[PDB]
Amino acid sequence: MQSINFRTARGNLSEVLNNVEAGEEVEITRRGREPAVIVSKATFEAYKKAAL
Amino acid sequence: MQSINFRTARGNLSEVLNNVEAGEEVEITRRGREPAVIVSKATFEAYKKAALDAEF
Amino acid sequence: MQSINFRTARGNLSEVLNNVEAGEEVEITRRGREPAVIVSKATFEAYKKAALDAEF
């Protein structure tokens, strides 16, 4: 799980989505905020289905 | 994989972690309990990700 | 994942191993060192097994 900052997430969003489509899990950190995660929807929905 | 009991681990935790960081996996056994394992974080995340990617 | 420092791991190891046996993954951090993970041996074996088999 790669960690990246906001400036990069925004400035490089196209390449981040590529990394993600390839199956990578990307954490976006923000100065003074909770971290988010970007991931493939299929994977995410698969996790959600499995949990449900 | 080396195997040690609870007491040995508790009394030697520092060197145990040094062994794990060096590239080793260490099993901790506990009387009447399921065994645990301690492994480098990077190694654990790698295995977990490869397991998920296969299963989902 | 749950994350604790070395001093805390060593002084609460029994409760840590109980947590892990109940399915919890616990990260142990150390100052100036790489983090370790403690997880049930069964879970870890299954993760790597699933990683092996994915490749073969």
Side-chain angles (χ1 to χ4, degrees), chain A residues 1-3 5-11 13-14 16-30 32-52, chain B residues 1 3-9 11-14 16-23 26-30 32-48 50-54 56, chain C residues 1 3-6 8-9 11-30 32-48 50-52 54:
Chain A
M1 165 137 36
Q2 310 181 349
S3 176
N5 63 26
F6 183 90
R7 314 186 292 271
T8 303
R10 193 214 59 93
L13 192 56
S14 312
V16 169
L17 291 179
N18 288 338
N19 288 345
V20 160
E21 191 162 44
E24 190 72 349
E25 301 180 346
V26 189
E27 162 186 359
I28 301 168
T29 59
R30 308 170 75 196
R33 301 294 214 104
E34 293 288 345
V37 168
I38 178 151
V39 67
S40 160
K41 186 189 174 181
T43 305
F44 186 64
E45 279 302 348
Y47 296 165
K48 266 146 60 83
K49 200 200 75 168
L52 283 184
Chain B
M1 173 188 307
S3 181
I4 60 175
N5 61 54
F6 171 73
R7 285 170 287 108
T8 295
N12 307 78
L13 194 53
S14 195
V16 171
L17 290 182
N18 290 345
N19 285 341
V20 170
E21 173 185 291
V26 187
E27 175 175 34
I28 308 186
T29 64
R30 214 147 98 263
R33 295 297 201 104
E34 312 294 330
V37 76
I38 157 148
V39 57
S40 84
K41 183 177 199 287
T43 292
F44 182 68
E45 297 293 0
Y47 291 9
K48 189 186 188 188
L52 265 167
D53 284 353
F56 279 65
Chain C
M1 183 169 50
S3 177
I4 57 171
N5 62 43
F6 178 78
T8 300
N12 296 100
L13 197 62
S14 286
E15 23 198 312
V16 165
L17 288 177
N18 290 337
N19 280 347
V20 168
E21 161 170 332
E24 195 169 334
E25 297 170 343
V26 170
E27 178 186 354
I28 302 177
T29 60
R30 282 201 294 169
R33 292 301 209 100
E34 300 309 315
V37 174
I38 173 166
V39 58
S40 99
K41 182 199 179 182
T43 294
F44 187 57
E45 291 288 17
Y47 287 170
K48 57 158 52 179
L52 281 321

